[PDB]
Amino acid sequence: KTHVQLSLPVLQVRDVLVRGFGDSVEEVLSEARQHLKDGTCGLVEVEKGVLPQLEQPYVFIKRSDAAPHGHVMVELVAELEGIQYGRSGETLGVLVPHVGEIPVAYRKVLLRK
């Protein structure tokens, strides 16, 4: 399937134990996709002071279309020192590994895979 229905656990930034996916744009995008497939991917909603508490490169999920079954359609865009690799709509948040942190909510998305 080109798209996969996922419910992503929304984590508070100060709870997150592993604050990024790796060390290159290509690695974070690869790791993000692997974790999304394995259901070990969390989502941190971006606000003032959230991104400086996480590790670059960042992986964003961004709205790719204006929402089957409640699931917003999203795609991945990485960012490293202010350059984004990808072009998409509004940020739904930043992806991080999930290693058992208690979520505050769940974000139903349809991931272009």
Swiss-Prot record:
Domain of life, per lineage: Viruses
Region (Disordered): 1-113
Localization in the cell: Host cytoplasm
Domain CoV Nsp1 globular intervals: 2-113
Coiled coil segments of this chain: none
Function according to Swiss-Prot or TrEMBL: Inhibits host translation by associating with the open head conformation of the 40S subunit. The C-terminus binds to and obstructs ribosomal mRNA entry tunnel. Thereby inhibits antiviral response triggered by innate immunity or interferons. The nsp1-40S ribosome complex further induces an endonucleolytic cleavage near the 5'UTR of host mRNAs, targeting them for degradation. This inhibits the integrated stress response (ISR) in the infected cell by preventing EIF2S1/eIF2-alpha phosphorylation upstream of stress granule formation and depletes host G3BP1.
Protein name: Host translation inhibitor nsp1
Originating species: Severe acute respiratory syndrome coronavirus 2 (2019-nCoV)
Lineage, top ranks: Viruses, Riboviria, Orthornavirae, Pisuviricota, Pisoniviricetes
Full protein: residues contained: 11 to 125 of 7096
